[PDB]
Ligand binder design. Sequence first.
Ligand code: ZN
Ligand code: ZN
Lengths: 134, 134, 304, 303, 303, 303
Amino acid sequence: TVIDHIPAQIGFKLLSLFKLTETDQRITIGLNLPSRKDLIKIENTFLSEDQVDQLALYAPQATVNRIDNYEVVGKSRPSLPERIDNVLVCPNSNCISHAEPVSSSFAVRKRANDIALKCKYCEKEFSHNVVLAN
Amino acid sequence: TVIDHIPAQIGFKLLSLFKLTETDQRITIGLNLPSRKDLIKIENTFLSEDQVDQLALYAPQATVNRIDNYEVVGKSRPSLPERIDNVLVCPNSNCISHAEPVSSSFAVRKRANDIALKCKYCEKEFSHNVVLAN
Amino acid sequence: ANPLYQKHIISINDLSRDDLNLVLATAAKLKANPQPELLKHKVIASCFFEASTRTRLSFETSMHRLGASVVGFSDSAKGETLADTISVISTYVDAIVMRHPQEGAARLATEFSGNVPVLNAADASNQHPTQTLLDLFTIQETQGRLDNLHVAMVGDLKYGRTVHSLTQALAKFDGNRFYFIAPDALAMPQYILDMLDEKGIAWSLHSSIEEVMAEVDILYMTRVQKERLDPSEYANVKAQFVLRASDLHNAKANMKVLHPLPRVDEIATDVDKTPHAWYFQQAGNGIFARQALLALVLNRDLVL
Amino acid sequence: NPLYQKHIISINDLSRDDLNLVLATAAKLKANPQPELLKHKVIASCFFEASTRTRLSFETSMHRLGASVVGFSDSANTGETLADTISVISTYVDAIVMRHPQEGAARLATEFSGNVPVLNAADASNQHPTQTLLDLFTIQETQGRLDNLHVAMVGDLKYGRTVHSLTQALAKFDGNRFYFIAPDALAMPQYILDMLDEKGIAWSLHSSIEEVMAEVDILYMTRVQKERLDPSEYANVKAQFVLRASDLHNAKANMKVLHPLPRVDEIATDVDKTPHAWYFQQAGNGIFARQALLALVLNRDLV
Amino acid sequence: ANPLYQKHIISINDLSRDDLNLVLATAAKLKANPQPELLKHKVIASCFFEASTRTRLSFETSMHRLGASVVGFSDSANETLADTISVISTYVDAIVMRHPQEGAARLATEFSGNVPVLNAADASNQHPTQTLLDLFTIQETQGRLDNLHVAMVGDLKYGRTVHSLTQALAKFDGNRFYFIAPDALAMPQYILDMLDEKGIAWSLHSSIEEVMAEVDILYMTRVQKERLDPSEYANVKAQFVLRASDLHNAKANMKVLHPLPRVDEIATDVDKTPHAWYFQQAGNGIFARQALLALVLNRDLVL
Amino acid sequence: NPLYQKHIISINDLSRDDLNLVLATAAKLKANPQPELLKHKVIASCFFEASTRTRLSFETSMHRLGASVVGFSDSANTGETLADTISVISTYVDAIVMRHPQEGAARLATEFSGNVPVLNAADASNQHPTQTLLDLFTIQETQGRLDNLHVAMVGDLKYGRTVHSLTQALAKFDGNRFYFIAPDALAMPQYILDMLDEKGIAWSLHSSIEEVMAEVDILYMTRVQKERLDPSEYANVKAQFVLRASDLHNAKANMKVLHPLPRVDEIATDVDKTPHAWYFQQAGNGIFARQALLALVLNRDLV
Ligand SMILES: [Zn+2]
Ligand SMILES: [Zn+2]
């Protein structure tokens, strides 16, 4: 699997948030290239559509192909998912999620100029900019 | 600058702890390579001898070459520094360092099987394994 | 199985319109015909992480009125995680009623209680469904229905969890006219209003109760906490949002006054004598609303 | 039952035959409920030292046997003598479950309760018999026996009332090898080791869990209170006495992890997924151990 | 000659511009040339009915810098005030007092006789000493108090500090105000009407970046989390914090001020920048408070 | 003085030559008062962790040099960062004496106080330099020297900040033999013993005071906190680490008894009559050690 046209300062973010370097496969990375884009290449690993969708909030107009069979096996652009878990933090400090050993979860819906993220636990809605600011 | 023979699952660690991806230069990375080894390469950027020393705890048997002069200008292995700042966290929970806007700082000294790290503030010594666990 | 058997009661958004009618019907039936031993050999945990004697007594009384056994605690103002605590308690008991100072705790309980259902007795500012079910069952008993009603809501509409849940719940029924009577600094939030617009539900703002008193079926008073504004603005504005018996001349004969309780200054005690006073009967109906909820969740076949 | 109308104060007071009776009754009450065995009985839940963890388990056991409960949980303050208190309460009720912040208080209750039995819910540092009984029933249920077992006890062995009681109780069974994993400042006391030597029981010391993980049937984690040393010394050495899921590769398939609770840092949450996690089932077994104990003391006939 | 001799300092509304000019001038003079024994043999009462260590330390330091002796008290978080002041006014020569009830310093005035009363804040009502130090800081850093671009950010609805500062700056000429606050914590109407009735220019803005280019003073206030729900807080907080990256458009003369303490309002990377002046602001508190005490306790100040 | 405008944070930071300077100045200030050496100076007595014992001694030293004092003693609660606090206070005053419940806080103050010196009144477990300096001055005054002395240290040697600092400081002097008298669970830590071995300094362990009483010049009692073990283990072993007057028969005539204070059970009151009692005179010497320390940091010339 290979990811193309990653924005600037989103490659290392994707590697960190999605824990891509927590494997034993051959991984190759490139930052600030001609387009200032970023590129991630990882051998012999398949991402479902959800994991590609989970990249939409951080790298929206990007491409995800597969080249573990020495050829362009599959094409894929990231569409926006209905739920985003395990990477976002609830801006509501009183949310029970923080202290406890659960996974954060936010429901997604498109607005004009904005993306609303409703927490699964505290049932509070936030703009994605506020969730991603922290 | 180019770094060779980075230990396994330490390349992404170095990028994270030392904030190496916070630049506009061309950065290229590889993890789980032939030796597995890792490689970090950043164009038009030089780290001094002290900054190379700061990798000693994380990448002990590693090599640092240079490719800004279109040839391998210098070879260099990391020696252990006297102080390690801004990356380590004090295991002492009552340390003032945590709450406050200061820089973490630990004095370094070798033991037989151990490496002592004395905090600048609480003046308490820990094994490098204990400091790196948290 | 009824549609609520062995399901958790966390949010009013999670309860469908079909579900709400079931709980209300079961409440009235349990009220008309007691079932004192419907939950014998059952042990329920009254877990009030945030202490609330008003709410705990109502819940625990409902528990006893169905012959259930009770264990619990009321903490004063936790090292062990809520997950660990509930993971333990879910091995002790058959149902968990819990009140918590952090939002989403009853939901977090669900993920660690296994097949022990978790009922929410309010999780801070988020939800308080039993109060809304208590409110609805009272409105239904006094108006005969939940549709085509004129409902006024007075007090702290910005921070009142009770009125947000109750407005949402009434929006699942048809032809309801809403009147929001609150000072500007405590107005009904936008997310409630658009929701009313998205279902084409009629709603209006009013500066005082005088405007709407003639054509209201429900007058719903909330507790205006003095801390939300400075004592100056409070004293300035409180006059427009209290209720005296003198204000009830034009009110309809069927109209009832409701209040989650406790009341401080909102409702003068001369209203208690009037036949529109129903806030105490409202609290009393809490027993049946929570009785119904417990029964529906802990038995499959309810001989109603 | 030879325990009818007798008090449950200390684990030294319980004979080996007695322990077998409680365990058997626990299993029987667990398999087939007896909801009304103690109907019309009134038990006093007297928590002089408040403990919600312990009280909920006890009172649930009481109610699971259809008994009514009266009690109290005093707030942290340190008037009426304990003797006077029990002399009064023993006129109201049929059994007294009590937790007290002073050692020997449940024993003192015995001398003023007459023939009203007194069950100890822990009197500070010495005894806590119900915790040991639930521990045993859990070990026995998961291992099929209490003899010839490899039992590791990790954490604060110097100040752990739970592990001293549990070691003594297991020392009344045969062929058990013990592994004590604790820092030197919180080592198992001398009087426990001598007790094991006087019965020719095998025991060994270990610096870490890695040494013993392969050959253990029971891993018993305790809460190392950070207060026992300064936060520095704790942080320096604690790493060898916490438990991560990655440490369970060589562990035996039948092996279970146990913990009195609550866990702070000792047990990482990745263990919960593994089938070795039994600290929650352990707490659940508390209900049956205490149901049995109450029944044996307030009834003669296994109904 | 000195219209503030033996007069009380209760409200900023009570001080005329002529009075404010005198206090500012005396502050600057005392700063340049100390007067360590100007108030020798004087005894001042530091009466903090509502405890405030930040305010008490600054006040009492000012007292000692003029060679005065200090007596006082700081009550915990929970006899009529008239009796108290009637008694204390027989002990001391001046009364600096902070009280949790609005108008208390005024009530003290009516029972202190000829002992002057200085207000260290009466809850939501007034806090003149903070405003005077604010003014002296703005004046020192901008060279003037007229024709300035002054932005006020944060909790403008409940900030006693900013109401007084806006009122006080409205007695100077050509000041343009920029109020940057969420709608639920907007600047009150009676302050805006006050600005309109004197034809003073003011505008509202959603964020600090909107105005950063054209500001000489950026005045940050502490948005207390209790005034909104943590959810509404999190939604809106982003537009009212300040990071060093936001100071690229700032003018070279611009300074950042803050009553203190800062929680999340001002990121710590700003302290390095030359726009950080909130600590120097607090440092100026002594001179504003030295001046106020000196002017009040002497008829002839030979400076 | 080579210490002018330098902070007093750790005993490792003080050189041997520095210690000699403070001791000499203490003796000089004691013999001939200098009541106005720090006149017109304002010192901040910042006791983040309240300690009336320590504060009274410090503030008396401040006033004995004619300085004015402002400060606070916070109540037991665990907002504004310590960095922000010192950044503010360092604008008010000329020196900061501070006691803090978190280790390294006085060091953190140094990085935000600028050129305002910070004196440490103890930051929890690590350092407490003024206590060691008063201990030294007392030992030196009563023995005439700090070299070739027989010094016994009794009590809680594991958690005693006072004795670790005092041992390090005496290890900078020559030919001193140390006797450590403590129960095994509260023994002198390893890093102190290695420090003594690396300088070839003689040290020995002892179970009781009777062994060493004949050949000691200094008997240094510490407070064994009952909390460090359970009351039983304390009571069992404590008898070997208290001091009765009857134990002083063979003691040398020049020998003195020292104690940081407060004494609970460690020292029976019959010692007060003996001429070996010097713990109160020790506390009295605290005034002069701290007078000297303040003077050296705020003045160059021995007036
Ligand atoms: Zn949330
Ligand atoms: Zn530290």
